Amino acid sequence: YYTRGFQHTGIYSVMIQKVILRDLLRFLLVYLVFLFGFAVALVSLSRERSILDASLELFKFTIGMGELAFQEQLRFRGVVLLLLLAYVLLTYVLLLNMLI
Amino acid sequence: YYTRGFQHTGIYSVMIQKVILRDLLRFLLVYLVFLFGFAVALVSLSRERSILDASLELFKFTIGMGELAFQEQLRFRGVVLLLLLAYVLLTYVLLLNMLI
């Protein structure tokens, strides 16, 4: 908060704060909704990632990690791969939209 | 320094140097302050990451690594996860602010 002085910082800081408060508040909701939906779909498909709380994989994907590979024992591996691809393209598209 | 010639490079180089010297000098301070605060909080919470010098995890997070996962033996795993989420959103927001 104490960046009120130092004009060179403040001129940009106030306007970027206004922009962020106006815009980013409508990102986290939709991204979280999509993440929860995809996590529920994955845990429901993989039961035959063991619990709903194991949604950290999507966060690893959006931060860089994720370990995208075949699941071997899961027979419906193609469907899981397609779901992961859909999720990654969707989140990249959404972040591109925010950036623009 | 020897890029003074080669006009096509220099026209952009001088102005981008001025911009960087004016702007980036007020990023590393605040980012380092937040990183140190979060590292101290994590090491203080996890004592019951073993030392203050183990702040490299946040740098791994900001470069792509980080190994975001449950800590098992640490009972207050939810608080640690919430702190990590707060830190990652904070640093992404700060870098977005710089970019804009």
- Please provide the DSSP assignment of B75-88 as one string: TTHHHHHHHHHHHH
Count Cβ atoms below 10 Å from residue A38 Cβ, excluding itself.
21
Closest CA to A42 of A30, A29, A53: A53
Chain B nearest C-alpha distance from A69 (Å): 17
| Token output for B7 | 């006009």
Give the span between the Cα atoms of B27 and B94, in whole angstroms: 9
Resolution in A: 3.1
- B-chain CB neighbours of A59 within 8 Å are 68
Using the Cβ of A65 and the Cβ atoms of chain B, whether some distance falls under 8 Å is answered with: yes
Give the span between the Cα atoms of A91 and B4, in whole angstroms: 42
Give the span between the Cα atoms of A53 and A39, in whole angstroms: 9
Give the span between the Cα atoms of A56 and A35, in whole angstroms: 10
- Nearest residue of A to residue B100 by CA position? A16
Look up residue B54 and give its amino acid: A
Technique employed here was cryo-EM
- The set of residues, in sequence order, having a beta carbon less than 8 Å from that of B5 and lying 6+ positions away, is none
A67 within 8 A of A59, measured Cβ to Cβ = no
